[PDB]
Amino acid sequence: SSVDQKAISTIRLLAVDAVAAANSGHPGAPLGLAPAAHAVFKKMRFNPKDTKWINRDRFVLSNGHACALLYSMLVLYGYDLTVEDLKKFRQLGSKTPGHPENTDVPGAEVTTGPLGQGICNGVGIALAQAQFAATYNKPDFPISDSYTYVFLGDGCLMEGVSSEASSLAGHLQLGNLIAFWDDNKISIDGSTEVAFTEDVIARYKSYGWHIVEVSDADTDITAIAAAIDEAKKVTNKPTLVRLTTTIGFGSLAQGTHGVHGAPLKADDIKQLKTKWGFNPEESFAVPAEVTASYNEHVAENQKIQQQWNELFAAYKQKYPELGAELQRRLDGKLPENWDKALPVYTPADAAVATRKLSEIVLSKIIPEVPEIIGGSADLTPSNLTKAKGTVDFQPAATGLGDYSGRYIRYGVREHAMGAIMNGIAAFGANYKNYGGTFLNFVSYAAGAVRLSALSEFPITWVATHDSIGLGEDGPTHQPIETLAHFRATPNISVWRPADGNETSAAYKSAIESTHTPHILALTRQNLPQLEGSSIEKASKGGYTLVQQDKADIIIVATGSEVSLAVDALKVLEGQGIKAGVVSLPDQLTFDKQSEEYKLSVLPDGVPILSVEVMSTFGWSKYSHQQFGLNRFGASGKAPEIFKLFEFTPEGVAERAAKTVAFYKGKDVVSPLRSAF
């Protein structure tokens, strides 16, 4: 019956009432975690009226099904979310969707719900904060000193992605990361004894985390606050706080799987209210004393931000160049004319693999754009992702790098790399971050990649060894389905550049992006510089490489197959067939061009054949016939594999000639046309 106790009851009952109104959602974890949420938010620095303050503490709800809890906190603190929004929990079009979405929910830093992601996002927010602080802080100028608080449950701890990120976070000594495990011994299938009997705490010690255990987290907010204070004293380890809770605390059904994921019974809600001093006839109650208490904390936080703004002004006076850089980044702007650093090629230049062209781009743009950081999942000398002369992001205590470093050694951890990249993007400050692996193993990170798209984060995958062109490693390494998968996902730019100019256009798009993740599919093998390519034309996503006003056929291709199409054009000329060539380095960018531009590239009245050594899925958007690879690859020298599958100038020409013959006497309209 203190104000703190009343606040905790208010949180619990708002969450339960939201689930009740929707007749859908998850009351168990909100009931169990309300004390911890109250305690953590009271320690956090944040401004509900400025969700982007760069020195705010960040909170991540990794157990995203518990979002009625998050929404209740945001409402109580006066974010741009109200009780009326809570009444619309899980209703079409509301600001309170069934799992939190950063695009829709003020105060949701990331999109969670798919288990394991949020803790990894928290690792990335903390990684970014450490890099940012190392870049900008000066004596008497703690520009960045914020913490990252993460709630997670048993499901997050079972998902392998969280193990990857936790191993890495311990290695990186990320002392401003404080995670809280909802140790409630229940998941959907019942007791954790049925599937999850590991010693979690011993595992986290093995990663180099600090541990604090709170044995009565249903009530002991003093101990939760003390655990935070303890964690802040351990500056060289991330901390895991074990919150031993009862799922559904207070419910008649507390401590059971039934309270995880379905609305409580009406009589249960009544007894909750009466036990805690609330009116069982009232829903969505917000006692004004709770509002007052929370408003006091907001007002204090706003005074902290006000002082930070003055610190920043003084920083700009003392450190004019760093201050201007920081201001530009907080405004969301890249350096003026940064793109003049992009390499440009001519057809007289030598053939180069697009992985090597990518290395060259990075080596030119990293010195010009400080907000670029990135790494590789143990493939640095293969993906070619590190610029010479940069230092790795490591704790200085290791001697292996510094937090001011710009290159991240992710280890063999693609999925966590993907989710950490999302967290780096979520930090803000214009970070443009990237992660390298082989294209076929981007698939290990599909859970996170999809969330990059849904969350609208401008992350970049440097995805080398894109096809059978990699050769001898064979079919376990050779993508077939991978581009189709990601192209079929909304809001993913999938660049497959053919040459030096196209590779620079791909990076221009990836770095300028503010709302769209990028995958750059890059070759092991050398490709020629194309006659007709440029950054300008490739920036349109698709363009006419070879214009033929009397074309019998247009060949549309990507990447390594554009040069193949150009060679096929010459074979076809000897057969009396005139071809044009279209290069389609990014289907999403192309799709976003005007209808008239797109029709200038893929006109009516001419058959169009696509060529790409991967799945034919998607290609009918742009072509009448498709020459692709819809079977697994082979282990051998790459030129021999191309010959086996007839991806040769003669093989393409044969299929082009068959396409011309198939449409003889038919009326052909652009693949871009549709009935609706």
Ligand X SMILES: Cc1ncc(C[n+]2csc(CCOP(=O)(O)OP(=O)(O)O)c2C)c(N)n1
Which spans of this chain sit near Ca ion (rule: CB under 5 A)?
Answer: 153-154, 184, 186-187
Are the C-beta atoms of 460 and 400 separated by less than 8 Å? no
Write the single-letter amino acid at 353. Answer: A
321 annotated ligand binder = no
154 annotated ligand binder = yes
Residue from 360, 618, 622, 647 in contact with a second copy (CB under 8 A):
618
With binding defined as CB under 6 A, does residue 540 bind ligand X? no
Name which of 24 and 271 has its Cβ closer to a second copy.
Answer: 24
With binding defined as CB under 8 A, does residue 625 bind a second copy? yes
Residue least distant from Ca ion (Cβ):
154
Task: List the beta bridge partners of residue 521.
Answer: 463
With binding defined as CB under 6 A, does residue 153 bind ligand X? yes
The site map against a second copy for 424-443 (x = CB under 8 A) is: ----------------xx-x
With binding defined as CB under 6 A, does residue 482 bind ligand X? no
Calculate the CA dihedral of residues 423, 428, 430, 432 and round it to 10 degrees. Answer: 0
In whole angstroms, what is the distance from residue 456 CA to residue 461 CA?
Answer: 15
Q: How many of the chain's residues bind ligand X (CB under 6 A)?
A: 24
Are the C-beta atoms of 666 and 605 separated by less than 8 Å? no
> How many C-beta atoms surround the C-beta of residue 171 within 10 A?
16
User: Please, which of residues 60-79 interact with a second copy by CB under 8 A?
Assistant: 64
With binding defined as CB under 6 A, does residue 174 bind ligand X? no
Name residues whose C-beta falls within 8 Å of residue 628's C-beta, 6 or more positions apart in sequence: 610, 611, 612, 613, 614, 615, 616, 619
Alpha helices in 470-608 (DSSP H): 482-487, 500-512, 535-538, 560-574, 587-591, 595-601
With binding defined as CB under 6 A, does residue 28 bind ligand X? yes
Relative orientation angle of helices 160-171 and 117-136, to the nearest 10 degrees: 20
Structure tokens at 79: 């974010």
With binding defined as CB under 6 A, does residue 613 bind ligand X? no
Distances (CA, A) of 167 to 171, 207, 412, 573, 634: 6, 5, 11, 58, 35
With binding defined as CB under 8 A, does residue 659 bind a second copy? yes
Maximum Cα–Cα distance across the chain: 91
Residue from 55, 102, 111, 187 in contact with ligand X (CB under 6 A):
187
Residue from 46, 444, 486, 642 in contact with ligand X (CB under 6 A):
444
With binding defined as CB under 8 A, does residue 3 bind a second copy? no
Name which of 362 and 505 has its Cβ closer to a second copy.
Answer: 362
Which residue of the set 101, 159, 359, 414 is catalytic? 414
Reduced to 3 DSSP states, what percent helix, strand and coil does the chain have, rounded to the nearest 5? 45, 15, 45
Minimum CB separation of residue 570 from a second copy in Å reads 20
With binding defined as CB under 6 A, does residue 326 bind ligand X? no
The site map against a second copy for 308-347 (x = CB under 8 A) is: ----------------------------------------
Are the C-beta atoms of 165 and 418 separated by less than 8 Å? no
155 annotated ligand binder = yes
Name residues whose C-beta falls within 8 Å of residue 229's C-beta, 6 or more positions apart in sequence: none
Minimum CB separation of residue 275 from a second copy in Å reads 28
Tokens 């010459």 label which residue? 570
- Helix (H) or strand (E) holding 582, with range, is strand 579-583
> Would you call 198 a catalytic residue per the annotation?
no
In whole angstroms, what is the distance from residue 592 CA to residue 672 CA?
Answer: 13
Write the single-letter amino acid at 140. Answer: D
Residue from 10, 376, 533, 558 in contact with a second copy (CB under 8 A):
376
With binding defined as CB under 6 A, does residue 85 bind ligand X? no
- List the one residue out of 589, 540, 581 whose CA is nearest residue 563: 581
485 annotated ligand binder = no
Q: What is the DSSP string of 208-227?
A: T-EEEEETTTTT-HHHHHHH
In whole angstroms, what is the distance from residue 259 CA to residue 527 CA?
Answer: 59
The entry of Ca ion, ligand X, a second copy, none that residue 28 binds, CB within 5 to 8 Å by partner kind: ligand X
382 annotated ligand binder = yes
Name which of 159 and 502 has its Cβ closer to a second copy.
Answer: 159
Residue from 40, 186, 240, 557 in contact with ligand X (CB under 6 A):
186
With binding defined as CB under 8 A, does residue 622 bind a second copy? no
With binding defined as CB under 8 A, does residue 575 bind a second copy? no
In this chain, which stretch among 298-306, 363-371, 498-506, 617-625 interacts with a second copy, using CB under 8 A?
Answer: 617-625
Tokens 């001419």 label which residue? 606
With binding defined as CB under 6 A, does residue 65 bind ligand X? yes
User: Please, which of residues 145-174 interact with a second copy by CB under 8 A?
Assistant: 154-156, 158-164, 167-168, 170-171
With binding defined as CB under 6 A, does residue 409 bind ligand X? no
Minimum CB separation of residue 170 from ligand X in Å reads 19
Write the single-letter amino acid at 111. Answer: T
Structure tokens at 443: 């698939």
645 annotated ligand binder = no
In this chain, which stretch among 239-247, 268-276, 544-552, 616-624 interacts with a second copy, using CB under 8 A?
Answer: 616-624
First vs last C-alpha separation in the chain: 62
Distances (CA, A) of 409 to 301, 393, 676: 36, 8, 48
In whole angstroms, what is the distance from residue 438 CA to residue 113 CA?
Answer: 27
Q: Residue positions in the annotated binding site?
A: 26, 65, 113-115, 154-155, 184, 186, 260, 355, 382, 414, 441, 465, 473, 524
Q: Residue positions in the annotated binding site for substrate?
A: 26, 260, 355, 382, 465, 473, 524
Q: Residue positions in the annotated binding site for Mg(2+)?
A: 154, 184, 186
Report the catalytic residues: 414
> Which residues contribute to the site for ligand X (CB under 6 A)?
28-29, 63, 65, 113-115, 153-156, 159, 182, 184, 186-188, 247, 260, 378-379, 412, 441, 444
